[PDB]
Amino acid sequence: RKRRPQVKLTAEKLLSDKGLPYVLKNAHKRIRISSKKNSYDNLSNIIQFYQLWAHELFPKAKFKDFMKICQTVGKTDPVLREYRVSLFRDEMGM
């Protein structure tokens, strides 16, 4: 009957288990900065982790595109706001 609805980023995907919680678990281990490298290699070490994780969550879209989409969703969704403030409230509590 219909055309298939478009797959699109939303908190029900972006908040889900391999998702922001996967970043909070793995990134502090996998992303390493030093003045012993040039700035361009440090930037590449940051960007690798997020590029592979963005490919795992939403393989449809390029990395710059995924960033523009995350900006619009974090600006609009109240549940995503509630999750982010909840993370900061934990660090303030400690």
Binding site: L24, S35, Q51, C70
Partner: protein
């Protein structure tokens, strides 16, 4: 209807052959009744194009070549008939037909515009009639090498010879006619292409934009030929005497001319700051360095050689990428894995006026010949030293009265003329020391500051951006002038005091909207803001409070979006941006305001070997900034691990968490 069109063409073609001919005894002879044929053709232009808004007569007079085969030869012979007599020092009859030939030249050369109020027939013919106007410009500039421009100045001399007081209005009209003729011959400019979009694109785009007639080159129409024909026909000497003799009727046509042939010259070519072979060599070494980077990204064997990589990733799973270059370079592999994605997010992207510094590309430059470049710079230097000061003083009065009547075209050709001349004359007085700055001292006078500021304010309030853009340009130049005269040394303080509350809020709002508009708009906002902050810093209401008015996410957004275009920016504009990021990082300690991901990608894309040139002065301070940025980012992340998500998203406004996010207790 079509019978009416073919009868109109037949009637005008029979009038066109009635004017005269080569005589063949070749020396062009006036037809008997030529004056009546010229007056009848003027009647045809009026009684059709005014009365019915058609453009059909103005179209078909080009078909039968009336301008290039009758009006031009008639004016050029009459010029010779008066030049010879002046060197010897019914001519009262031939005056009337020379005047009426100039009248028809001005009508045929009049600028074309299309609007909501435009006729269904005018919008049909518009794109075509621009081609005939291009042929008219080529023919006017090249037919006996601008002897017709010499005939035009002669018809002006005929009324300059009788006194400023003892003249009649029917002669001041002739002055305005001759000035309008020159502004037209200048401002014939190649047309826009236009497509109907009711029907979607085929599998190729618009395969040619080339809006030129079959025997016109782009160079036959360029300012090089304009400057050449003006210098050879002593036009500049006429304009210079005219703009000095102002001690009201004509000031606005005269400003229009100075706008129409200063508009697209970026001034910096007028100042260099085997030489052309050395210049060619340096550019070939930059293209060689770029091709060296492309060669370092290219296959060392053929296209079909077929090597295939698998990338293991966390969750102990595979991707695959083709090509020998990807096997060895992990960064190329991941770049290729993103390049192949068949999705793109849909982008969003953005009037009767000429193409100008508002609209032309940031990289655009007009290539003067060496004699043309000296003939131009000497003309404008004489004009600045003679007449700019009195001309600006006159038109700023005429438009401080009468503001509400200025339709957008007058408003631009005033604002841009003011900005371009003040920028050129600041730059001349930078390199030359015998240039006075104070020669343009009129620009800082209170009446002109008030006009420029009022005009920008009303354009912003009425949301007329083309005028706000022109306002922002002129205000940026007035600020450059103020800063220069302050460094040289009370009129500075009067203007500097005059913006303390409301213009501050306006100029702070300008970059917040900037991210919605063209590269030229963002460029102007950034140049203005750099100049403002440099002024307010030098003067110290409260620098910390006023800059905190600028330190907000929407401004950082338009700065990132201007910096995304960097491959087509110049080192000056990149140095302005990174000075502002240095100001935000060091002077404010705002640093969380910049940690968003868009900046991190953009630093990598320009710090890359494929990005900025390694020998560029521009790369050196980007590399320095990046080292400080990554140090503060590492510190922030080690102290607060949540910043990995906070860096991915825009900032929060729930009060306690929003403060903690921004500053780390």
């Amino acid at each position: 209807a079509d019978f009416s069109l073919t009868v109109l063409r037949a009637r005008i073609a029979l009038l066109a052959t009635a004017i005269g001919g080569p005589d063949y005894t070749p020396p062009y002879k006036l037809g008997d009744d030529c004056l009546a044929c010229l007056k009848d053709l003027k009647r045809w232009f009026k009684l059709v194009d005014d009365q019915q808004k058609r453009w059909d007569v103005a179209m078909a007079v080009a078909e039968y070549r009336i301008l290039t085969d009758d009006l031009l030869p008639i004016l050029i012979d009459w010029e010779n008939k008066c030049s010879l007599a002046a060197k010897l020092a019914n001519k009262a009859y031939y005056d009337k037909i020379a005047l009426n030939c100039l009248q028809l030249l001005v009508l045929m050369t009049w600028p074309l515009i299309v609007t909501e109020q435009s006729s269904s027939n005018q919008i049909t013919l518009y794109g075509e009639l621009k081609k005939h106007q291009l042929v008219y410009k080529k023919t006017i500039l090249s037919m006996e090498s601008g002897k017709v421009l010499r005939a035009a100045i002669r018809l002006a001399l005929d009324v300059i010879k009788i006194d400023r007081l003892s003249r009649t209005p029917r002669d001041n009209m002739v002055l305005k006619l001759v000035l309008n003729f020159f502004r037209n011959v200048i401002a014939i400019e190649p047309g826009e292409f236009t497509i109907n979009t009711k029907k979607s694109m085929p599998k190729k785009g618009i395969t040619s934009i080339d809006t030129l007639p079959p025997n016109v080159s782009m160079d036959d129409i360029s300012l090089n030929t304009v400057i050449s024909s003006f210098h050879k026909n002593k036009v500049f000497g006429f304009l210079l005497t005219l703009t000095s003799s102002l001690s009201d009727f004509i000031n606005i046509p005269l400003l229009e001319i100075m706008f129409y042939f200063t508009k697209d010259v970026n001034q910096e070519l007028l100042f260099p700051r085997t030489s052309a072979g050395f210049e060619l060599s340096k550019l070939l070494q930059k293209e060689h360095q770029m091709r060296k980077n492309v060669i370092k990204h290219t296959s060392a064997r053929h296209s079909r050689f077929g090597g295939l990589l698998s990338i293991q990733t966390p969750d102990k799973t595979r991707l695959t990428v083709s090509g020998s270059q990807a096997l060895v370079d992990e960064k190329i592999a991941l770049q290729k894995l993103d390049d192949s994605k068949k999705w793109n997010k849909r982008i969003i992207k953005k009037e009767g006026l000429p193409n100008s510094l508002l609209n032309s590309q940031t990289g655009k430059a007009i290539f003067f010949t060496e004699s043309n470049g000296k003939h131009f710079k000497e003309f404008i230097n004489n004009f600045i030293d003679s007449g700019f000061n009195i001309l600006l003083h006159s038109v700023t009065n005429y438009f401080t009265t009468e503001q509400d009547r200025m339709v957008t075209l007058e408003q631009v050709e005033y604002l841009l003329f003011f900005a371009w001349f003040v920028k050129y004359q600041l730059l001349r007085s930078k390199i030359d020391n015998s240039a006075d700055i104070k020669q343009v001292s009129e620009a800082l006078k209170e009446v002109t500051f008030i006009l420029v500021s009022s005009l920008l304010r009303s354009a912003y309030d009425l949301k007329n951006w083309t005028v706000t853009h022109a306002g922002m340009i002129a205000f940026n130049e007035l600020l450059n002038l103020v800063s220069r005269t302050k460094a040289a040394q009370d009129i500075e303080f009067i203007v500097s005091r005059l913006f303390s509350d409301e213009r501050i809020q306006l100029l702070s709002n300008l970059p917040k909207i900037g991210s919605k508009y063209s590269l030229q708009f963002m460029k102007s906002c950034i140049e203005l803001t750099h100049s403002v902050l440099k002024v307010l810093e030098q003067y110290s209401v409260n620098f910390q409070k006023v800059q905190a008015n600028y330190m907000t996410e929407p401004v950082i957004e338009t700065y990132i979006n201007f910096l995304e275009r960097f491959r087509e920016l110049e080192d000056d504009s990149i140095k302005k941006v990174f000075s502002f990021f240095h100001r935000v990082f060091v002077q404010a300690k705002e640093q969380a305001l910049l940690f968003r991901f868009d900046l991190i990608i953009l630093l990598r894309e320009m710090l890359s070997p494929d990005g900025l040139d390694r020998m560029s002065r521009s790369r050196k301070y980007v590399s320095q900034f990046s080292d400080y940025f990554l140090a503060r980012l590492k510190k922030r992340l080690k102290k607060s691990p949540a910043w990995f998500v906070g860096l991915l998203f825009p900032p929060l406004h729930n009060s306690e968490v929003g403060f903690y996010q921004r500053y780390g207790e």
